Symmetry: D2
Subunit: 125 residues, 4 copies
């Protein structure tokens, strides 16, 4: 069993009101769905990612990351976001992340292809 | 079949000499392995991600992203990188990406948890 | 007079307990000092930057950015941070920012030269 | 005299065909102008920044950063870019950078306020 398999698995909410539902596998897998409260998005989108299933025991958080491609049965925003961050357990559990959102562009517009931001996920909104 | 399922699937090399081997599924899945030429890494690491299986037909690239957690049978660097970018087909096919590498840290060191960079992947090194 | 010359000029504090003291000039200049509560830093460091002295009047924030090179009379951390963000006026005035911290490295270590994060600045801590 | 005062001062060109003209002061100052080959920009824009005037002598590059607010006598793009990077001397001198471009936005659009990219500057294009 991954050290934080149980801690990570479940439903998380960010500061924008988005919903991230994930299952963490014993050997580092992350599968789930993401629903964005903002942007060119509707309903749930597949996500997959990875996490460190054997983190340091020194009080450090647990490194993880995942991707959503913004295509589902309702919409295609020709874009993909990746979240990179760490899970922190305890009464105030939180997944703190930075993210990159890249659109498909022409070569001429590629300089402006990628947004950066930060999302913090909590178990209760 | 994803528009670029065939274009994406295969072996890619970046400017550092890293090797990314990926299979793109018809409905947006990315699975594979990553071997880093640099950092606290040895041999192959699992990766998963997503791509836009129906990109714009206007000459735009194809949005995609993936994650590696830097734990395998040889090492655990308590970290995860996500690559966010776009695939561009044609004689000079390339996956252009920006990435975020987050380590597990204490809360005191969390301000310095995350590296950012950029990798460009080609079919021949 | 810059629209937010008065709003921006003064002392700001971030979530880490750092202190940013800045003067905004009528034609877009930012000068001041920065004192970091964290990292390889002691006392004040020079900063300079720029801001949009004629922002949109539609309720948008005011774009701005500044740099600190982490060399002063006490220390040299061979690094520089740039903050890019927007100032938002009103009872809850805030400067919201993302930042890049680049160290001087050898070419071999250049892939790991740059940290990314986010600071939010307030008028009262 | 800053170690790389002479090396940095002058005209640089990036991969997009932009022109950066800068003067480095003996005590870490950077002043100059920037002309973008892309985006909502015309002619030169003021820039200011900082650099490490006493870098490591171990072959490491020289940390530096600067800002442009995208307002001049011709246009106002209500935005500011900061470049964070390192200067590398020698026959192939280069300033390697990552950058953040923040627009002024409403609070509702703030999640999409900031672009990230990377520019490499050379002495000859
Ligand atoms: O809008 C989308 C799809 C939805 C993005 C949701 C973002 S993902 C990071 C953040 N965290 C959340 O929970 N929501 C937001 N793509 C797109 C394409 C072209 C230009 C632009 S600006 C945007
Ligand atoms: O070193 C690792 C594991 C290997 C990273 C490989 C990077 S991933 C982006 C880039 N692209 C490549 O192909 N290779 C590089 N983690 C780690 C932990 C704590 C502090 C630091 S500085 C680094
Ligand atoms: O430590 C420093 C100097 C102080 C940085 C202060 C940062 S600036 C962004 C953030 N916002 C604040 O208020 N404080 C923090 N440079 C350095 C060199 C080599 C490796 C590393 S990891 C770090
Ligand atoms: O277009 C501008 C002003 C010119 C940016 C030039 C960039 S700065 C980084 C890069 N390096 C260069 O040399 N050129 C490019 N701002 C703006 C406002 C709202 C939305 C968007 S997408 C863009």
């Amino acid at each position: 069993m991954g050290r934080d398999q149980a801690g990570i698995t479940g439903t998380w909410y960010n500061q924008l009101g988005s919903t991230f539902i994930v299952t963490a596998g014993a050997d580092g897998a992350l599968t789930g769905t993401y629903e964005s409260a903002v942007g060119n998005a509707e309903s749930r989108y597949v996500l997959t990612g990875r996490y460190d299933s054997a983190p340091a025991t020194d009080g450090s958080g647990t490194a993880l990351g995942w991707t959503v491609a913004w295509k589902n049965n309702y919409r295609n925003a020709h874009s993909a976001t990746t979240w990179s961050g760490q899970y922190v357990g305890g009464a105030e559990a939180r997944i703190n992340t930075q993210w990159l959102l890249t659109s498909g562009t022409t070569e001429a517009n590629a300089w402006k292809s990628t947004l950066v931001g930060h999302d913090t996920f909590t178990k209760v909104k």
